[PDB]
Amino acid sequence: RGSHMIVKNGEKWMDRYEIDSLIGKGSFGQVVKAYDRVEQEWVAIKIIKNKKAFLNQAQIEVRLLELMNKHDTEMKYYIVHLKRHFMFRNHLCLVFEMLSYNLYDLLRNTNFRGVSLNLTRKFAQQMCTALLFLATPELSIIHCDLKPENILLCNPKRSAIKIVDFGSSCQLGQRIYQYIQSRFYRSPEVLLGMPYDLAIDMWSLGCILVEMHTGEPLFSGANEVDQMNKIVEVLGIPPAHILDQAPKARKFFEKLPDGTWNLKKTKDEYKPPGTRKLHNILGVETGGPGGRRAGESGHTVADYLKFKDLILRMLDYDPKTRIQPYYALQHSFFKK
Numbered sequence: 001r002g003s004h005m006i007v008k009n010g011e012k013w014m015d016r017y018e019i020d021s022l023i024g025k026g027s028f029g030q031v032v033k034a035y036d037r038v039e040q041e042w043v044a045i046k047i048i049k050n051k052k053a054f055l056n057q058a059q060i061e062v063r064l065l066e067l068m069n070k071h072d073t074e075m076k077y078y079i080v081h082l083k084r085h086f087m088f089r090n091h092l093c094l095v096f097e098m099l100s101y102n103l104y105d106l107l108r109n110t111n112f113r114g115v116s117l118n119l120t121r122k123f124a125q126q127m128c129t130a131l132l133f134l135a136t137p138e139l140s141i142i143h144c145d146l147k148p149e150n151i152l153l154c155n156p157k158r159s160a161i162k163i164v165d166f167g168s169s170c171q172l173g174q175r176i177y178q179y180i181q182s183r184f185y186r187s188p189e190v191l192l193g194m195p196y197d198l199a200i201d202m203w204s205l206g207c208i209l210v211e212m213h214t215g216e217p218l219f220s221g222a223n224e225v226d227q228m229n230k231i232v233e234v235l236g237i238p239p240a241h242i243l244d245q246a247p248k249a250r251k252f253f254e255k256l257p258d259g260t261w262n263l264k265k266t267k268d269e270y271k272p273p274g275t276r277k278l279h280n281i282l283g284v285e286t287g288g289p290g291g292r293r294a295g296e297s298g299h300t301v302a303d304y305l306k307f308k309d310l311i312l313r314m315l316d317y318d319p320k321t322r323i324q325p326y327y328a329l330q331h332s333f334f335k336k
């Protein structure tokens with residue numbers, strides 16, 4: 001009764017898994033911490049709900065994780081490792097390496113004042129390497145759900161991170177789900193109902209990295225129209241050649257007689273298009289977010305200008321010219 005598996009702390013599965021406790025949850029089902037008695041090690045077991053839509057999503061996840069594990073490259077280690085999968089009490093069970101807390105928990109630890117530019121840079125470099133791996137031709141995987149909750153520290157003391165949750169993922173050219181990406185991290189092409197490729201993940205990364213340094217979401221929309229309005233506050237009206245091709249352009253925008261585009265007024269205010277400058281959100285010249293980094297080492301105007309320049313390349317409206325992972329890794333923000 002119910003789609004979830006019932007789990008009692010202390011119980012043992014197939015004389016092997018000491019279900020320690022419950023460490024996670026989602027629309028997919030539950031994640032449990034269990035000791036693998038046979039392998040003398042902690043594992044995270046993702047227990048998929050007994051519902052066809054979530055079972056179908058998890059079989060795509062198993063297939064893409066096994067595709068990735070076939071690759072001889074050190075880059076694959078920014079992706080969470082699937083150890084095994086089996087059916088148990090009519091639930092699909094995915095056994096993962098045990099990781100530490102997600103990047104939202106890390107922000108909550110700072111009272112949402114943000115982590116340092118130095119740590120932000122370390123997360124940025126690993127995430128760009130993970131996106132480079134996903135962009136390998138034979139993979140061409142779109143994650144489609146990048147958010148701080150889906151980026152996990154390997155260890156609570158170190159900077160090493162891994163991407164989890166390929167449940168909403170697809171490969172280049174697929175259209176499977178009605179709505180994709182977590183709203184705050186959703187690319188303009190997805191809001192506009194346009195075709196989407198690996199560039200949507202780069203957009204999400206841009207939003208994530210600003211949130212990690214400032215402590216608060218760059219674009220916190222309560223709905224799709226509010227999301228697009230928040231993006232326009234910072235980046236201005238999207239290019240006419242994009243909006244001219246966009247199925248949902250008229251959800252947000254209106255074409256003038258002279259051929260130019262403006263915001264549709266809401267059925268009711270926002271800052272004028274492009275007036276909420278990322279320069280001021282980052283506090284490039286005013287001591288960083290809320291002035292809290294003033295004088296601190298690793299928070300110079302020069303460091304901030306490189307960060308801002310890389311972020312604005314990740315948040316390019318045009319998915320064709322948006323910076324790609326290979327080029328992102330060559331940016332002066334990452335220079336030793």
Ligand SMILES: Cc1nc2ccc(-c3cc(N)nc(N)c3)nc2n1CCOc1ccccn1
Pocket residue numbers: 023024025026031044046080096097098099100101102149150152164165166
């Ligand atoms: C502590 C820990 N280790 C994990 C290893 C893997 C996974 C894991 C792996 C895959 N493919 N999808 C999910 N959804 C979680 N989740 C782990 N968690 C804690 C739980 O985090 C989260 C994060 C996001 C959503 C739910 N729960």
